[PDB]
Amino acid sequence: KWWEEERNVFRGRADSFIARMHLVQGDRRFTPWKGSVVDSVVGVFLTQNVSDHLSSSAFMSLASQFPVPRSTMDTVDWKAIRAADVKEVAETIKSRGMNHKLAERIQGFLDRLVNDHGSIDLEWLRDVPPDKAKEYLLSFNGLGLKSVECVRLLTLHHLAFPVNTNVGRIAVRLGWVESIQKYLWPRLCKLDQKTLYELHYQMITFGKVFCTKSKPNCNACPMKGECRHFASAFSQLRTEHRVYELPDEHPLLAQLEKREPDDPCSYLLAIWVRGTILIPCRTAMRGSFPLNGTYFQVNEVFADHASSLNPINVPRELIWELPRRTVYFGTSVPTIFKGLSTEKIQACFWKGYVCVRGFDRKTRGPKPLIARLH
DNA sequence: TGTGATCCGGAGTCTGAAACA
DNA sequence: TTCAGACTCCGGATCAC
Ligand code: SF4
């Protein structure tokens, strides 16, 4: 019964990692998101070799330029994408990089889907056995294991665990451990889907925050006693702007879509009399984001572009008694957490927010963050 | 046959050199 | 002080020998 010890040692290590990151990085438990499965496949296409914020902004640009005229409904007109020339769809996702190659891959995927089934949809893939779905997804040109595992785990709710560069490095550095896939998949094949989802989410966030490739924050890492690099060893990055929290009954939020039932964070107002409103990411996207919105943090807000360009004149009486919270502006998640102490990261993730984007409400497209904020 | 390169590509940080002295 | 190149980012395909 060696496998009895094989699964027990990893389960104890995995649950210790999950419990510790719960206090530091907030609640990463599974919560459903809307959207179809073709959105997830295109997202995994767009996340090949690029940072997460760039890929998410590229998908937002795809949604904005091609708009729709767990509710499994398309947010993007994929028929128009297949109709659109490779040059224009490469222009849409230029900022992500590899625009032309990925545009051709996406057009080929959509064309093959139409040829196979006569319609761009993959809802029936949740009814087939998991292995058949994995083989069908692997049969596509431009998709490999790391992607199809992400698609299955985050969208099809199967039992899967993708091993990307961040996961492998963390596993090697910690007491754990295609070679990494062979070591981990048999040892991590029978666990609850919610547990796999939470582990994956906290692993990617931990790779972004504490355990980076260059100069990991080993001083403030909660896993110092369980690591090997720490065992063997022995600002312009972020701008903080204190803001006000706006209850949904406030007059300023009269025409702001009245949030979402499942959104865990409220609206914010960033005063410079004049203020800019910060719209939460889940509310701004109205759910319906690929891969269960694991591209954003739990405490992530956008910046209203119209409010940023022309701040709204507000009286000081309306915002007199509202509580005050930080936002920790910046340009990327890894940069704004560099050098931060454990208490600061915990406070930011539990009683704080994070903004690295600007959102245009009218066009639903990403915009660069304004100069004064960062 | 099993890696081992070389490609794709924008956007950012970060060094090292070439600079003040 | 300027400043350009290497490197990193939730990766596949195509040769080469
Ligand atoms: S101690 Fe350092 S190397 Fe180890 S897991 Fe933490 S950040 Fe990564």
Domain boundary among A186, A209, A232: A209
Backbone phi and psi for residue A96, each to the nearest 5 degrees, phi listed first: -75, -30
A155 and A256, same domain (yes or no): no
Integer CA distances (angstroms), A122 to A132, A146, A172, in order:
13, 19, 35
Cβ–Cβ < 8 Å for A43, A220: no
Measured CA to CA, the distance from residue A367 to residue A374 in angstroms comes to 13
- Residues 268-327 of A with CB within 7 A of strand C: 291, 294-295
Q: Per the annotation, does A281 bind a ligand?
A: no
Residue that is written with structure tokens 């939020």 in the block? A253
A68 and A148, same domain (yes or no): yes
Integer CA distances (angstroms), A210 to A116, A122, A176, A207, A367, in order:
44, 37, 17, 6, 28
How many CB atoms are located within 10 Å of the residue A7 CB? 16
Cβ–Cβ < 8 Å for A67, A364: yes
What Rg do the C-alpha atoms of chain A give, in angstroms?
21
Where does residue A174 fall: left (phi above 0), alpha (psi -120 to 50 degrees), or beta otherwise? beta
Of all atoms in ligand 1, which is nearest to the CA of residue A229? Answer: 3
Task: Using alpha carbons, select from A250, A245, A280 the residue that is nearest to residue A265.
Answer: A280
Which nucleotide lies closest to A142 by the C1' atom and the CA atom? C12
DSSP string, A176-222: ---HHHHHHTGGGSSS-HHHHHHHHHHHHHHHHHTS-SSS--TTT-T
Å from CA of A229 to ligand 1 middle = 7
- Pairing assessment for the beta strands A267-271 and A274-280 based on DSSP bridges: antiparallel
Measured CA to CA, the distance from residue A355 to residue A279 in angstroms comes to 10
Whether A162 CB is under 7 Å from strand C:
yes
How many CB atoms are located within 10 Å of the residue A74 CB? 16
Q: Per the annotation, does A189 bind a ligand?
A: no
Backbone phi and psi for residue A66, each to the nearest 5 degrees, phi listed first: -115, 90
Which secondary-structure segment (H or E) carries A90?
Answer: helix A86-92
Task: Using alpha carbons, select from A371, A338, A336 the residue that is nearest to residue A352.
Answer: A336
Burial class (CB in 10 A: 0-12, 13-18, 19+), A249: exposed
Structurally, how many domains does chain A consist of?
2
| A167 within some domain | yes
Cβ–Cβ < 8 Å for A342, A265: no
Indicate the SS3 state at residue A275. Answer: strand
A197 and A289, same domain (yes or no): no
Enclosing domain of residue A338: 243-367
DSSP string, A228-263: SHHHHH---S-B---EEEE-TTSGGGTTSTT--TT-
Measured CA to CA, the distance from residue A21 to residue A24 in angstroms comes to 5
Measured CA to CA, the distance from residue A268 to residue A88 in angstroms comes to 36
> Would you say the C-alpha torsion A266, A271, A273, A275 has a positive or negative sign?
negative
Cβ–Cβ < 8 Å for A239, A374: yes
Cβ–Cβ < 8 Å for A270, A305: no
Residue that is written with structure tokens 């245009």 in the block? A360
Measured CA to CA, the distance from residue A271 to residue A235 in angstroms comes to 21
- CATH classification of the domain holding A148: 1.10.340.30
Pocket test for ligand 1, best of A218, A224, A342 (most atoms within 8 A of CB): A218
A185 and A278, same domain (yes or no): no
Cβ–Cβ < 8 Å for A170, A307: no
Compute CA A214 distance to the chain's CA centroid, rounded to the nearest angstrom: 22
| A179 within some domain | yes
Å from CA of A74 to ligand 1 middle = 40
Measured CA to CA, the distance from residue A257 to residue A277 in angstroms comes to 13
- CATH classification of the domain holding A361: 2.30.30
Indicate the SS3 state at residue A1. Answer: coil
Which nucleotide lies closest to A338 by the C1' atom and the CA atom? B13
| A227 within some domain | no
Cβ–Cβ < 8 Å for A302, A281: yes
How many CB atoms are located within 10 Å of the residue A263 CB? 16
Integer CA distances (angstroms), A16 to A171, A175, A314, in order:
14, 12, 48
A113 and A175, same domain (yes or no): yes
| A31 within some domain | no
A45 and A114, same domain (yes or no): yes
Strand ranges for chain A from DSSP E: 243-246, 267-271, 274-280, 301-303, 312-313, 324-325, 358-360, 365-367
DSSP string, A276-343: EEEEEHHHHHTS--GGGG-SS-SS-EEEBHHHHHS-EE--TTTTSS--EE---B-S-HHHHTTT--HH
Cβ–Cβ < 8 Å for A201, A167: no
Backbone phi and psi for residue A365, each to the nearest 5 degrees, phi listed first: -115, 150
Cβ–Cβ < 8 Å for A359, A284: yes
Cβ–Cβ < 8 Å for A95, A58: yes
Task: Using alpha carbons, select from A202, A198, A195 the residue that is nearest to residue A166.
Answer: A202
A343 contact partners, CB below 8 Å, separation of at least 6: none
A55 and A183, same domain (yes or no): yes
Q: What is the resolution of this structure in A?
A: 3.1
Take residue A112 and report the two structure tokens written for it. 């093959």
A210 contact partners, CB below 8 Å, separation of at least 6: A216, A217, A218, A220, A221, A222, A223
Q: Per the annotation, does A355 bind a ligand?
A: no
